[PDB]
Amino acid sequence: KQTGYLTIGGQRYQAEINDLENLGEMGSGTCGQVWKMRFRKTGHVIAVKQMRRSGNKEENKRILMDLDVVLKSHDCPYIVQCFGTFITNTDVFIAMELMGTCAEKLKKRMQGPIPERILGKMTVAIVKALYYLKEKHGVIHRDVKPSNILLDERGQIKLCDFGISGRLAGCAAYMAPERIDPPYDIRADVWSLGISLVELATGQFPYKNCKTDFEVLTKVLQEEPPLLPGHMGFSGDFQSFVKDCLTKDHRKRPKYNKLLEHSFIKRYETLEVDVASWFKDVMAKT
């Protein structure tokens, strides 16, 4: 409702675009251009997305859509938080908390499987964020995948990027069977979450031998659901949870309310996992 303000933590600072120094771009254009910037008044370093008024019409619709969800989700601790906005005659700047890395780049830096104790805390955060979006807003994400799961140096794990979210098409590799072949898609992000967990738990994407998008959709419908390997020491609860996410018939796929009662969730809802120190170790490679 208000622009021209930054609220780092619990402190409000009147701010304009010229009060921030550009520390370079964070390379990708998933939604729009994202800059890493420094608040010269306090020294904090933040992420700012620049939306030009002359930019692509389709791209700007998604950037505003994503901002609409983020502003409404201010009270969800598993969703990324907007720090403020600046509106000029030619651009809109969206300030946001600076996270460390996404789960995709973490897998690339690790060059191998990601431990179960990290994926447990990630599962709890992603399930509760989706559950929050359905219940408090009737919004489904429609694009759950490791590149939209962010982690930071303090160990926080948060969902981001709601540019194609719906209020009741994503990447073909993570699309649920019913999204590919509709009979609805209320339980479709659950399938994407299970595909993402199998990928991070093994370091290998389950459909990695496909050369076109359509071939991936064919293997999703024709093959059995990709299982969690049984000789990597994974606990019975981790295997049981992924099997439930990856039910092929969406009618039999469990609900968010039922998934939040799984023994895999109850375990990591209360366990003390030092994901902050495990993060600093991965970031200190290569």
Ligand X SMILES: *CCC(=O)N1CCC[C@@H](n2nc(-c3cnc4[nH]ccc4c3)c3c(N)ncnc32)C1
Active site residue ranges: 143
Using the minimum distance from each CB to ligand X, give the nearer residue, 67 or 190. Answer: 67
| Residue 82 marked as a ligand binder | no
Q: In the structure encoding, which two tokens stand for residue 135, read together?
A: 């219940």
Q: In the structure encoding, which two tokens stand for residue 18, read together?
A: 């010229």
Gap between the Cα atoms of 46 and 36, Å rounded = 6
| Contact call for residues 159 and 141 (beta carbons, < 8 A) | yes
Q: Which of 34, 139, 190, 216 binds ligand X (CB under 6 A)?
A: 34
| Residue 283 marked as a ligand binder | no
CB of 141 to ligand X, least distance (A): 13
Which of 9-17, 25-33, 190-198, 206-214 is the region at the interface with ligand X (rule: CB under 6 A)? Answer: 25-33
44 is a site residue for ligand X (CB under 6 A): no
| Residue 210 marked as a ligand binder | no
Which of 23-31, 135-143, 214-222, 227-235 is the region at the interface with ligand X (rule: CB under 6 A)? Answer: 23-31
102 is a site residue for ligand X (CB under 6 A): yes
* Sequence-distant (≥ 6) Cβ neighbours of residue 150 within 8 angstroms: 80, 99, 100, 101, 102, 103, 157, 158, 159, 160
33 is a site residue for ligand X (CB under 6 A): no
Using the minimum distance from each CB to ligand X, give the nearer residue, 94 or 259. Answer: 94
Q: Which of 17, 19, 30, 234 binds ligand X (CB under 6 A)?
A: 30
The burial class, CB within 10 Å (0-12 / 13-18 / 19+), for 68 is middle
| Residue 69 marked as a ligand binder | no
Q: Which of 104, 185, 237, 244 binds ligand X (CB under 6 A)?
A: 104
160 is a site residue for ligand X (CB under 6 A): yes
| Residue 32 marked as a ligand binder | yes
94 is a site residue for ligand X (CB under 6 A): yes
161 vs 81, 125, 154, 174, 250, CA distance in Å? 11, 15, 21, 16, 24
Using the minimum distance from each CB to ligand X, give the nearer residue, 73 or 259. Answer: 73
Gap between the Cα atoms of 5 and 220, Å rounded = 47
Q: In the structure encoding, which two tokens stand for residue 95, read together?
A: 């300030």
98 is a site residue for ligand X (CB under 6 A): yes
- Quickly count: other Cβ atoms within 10 Å of residue 168's Cβ: 10
Gap between the Cα atoms of 251 and 239, Å rounded = 21
Which of 92-100, 133-141, 203-211, 244-252 is the region at the interface with ligand X (rule: CB under 6 A)? Answer: 92-100
CB of 43 to ligand X, least distance (A): 18
271 is a site residue for ligand X (CB under 6 A): no
| Residue 212 marked as a ligand binder | no
Q: Which of 7, 33, 42, 47 binds ligand X (CB under 6 A)?
A: 47
186 vs 98, 110, 161, 251, CA distance in Å? 30, 33, 18, 10
- Quickly count: other Cβ atoms within 10 Å of residue 57's Cβ: 6
Number of H helices, E strands in the chain: 10, 10
Residue 256 is inside which H or E element, if any? helix 256-259
Q: Which of 96, 151, 198, 265 binds ligand X (CB under 6 A)?
A: 96
Residues binding ligand X (CB under 6 A): 26, 28, 30, 34, 47, 49, 66, 80, 94, 96-99, 102, 104-105, 147, 150, 160-161
Please give the annotated binding residues for ATP, written as ranges. 26-34, 49
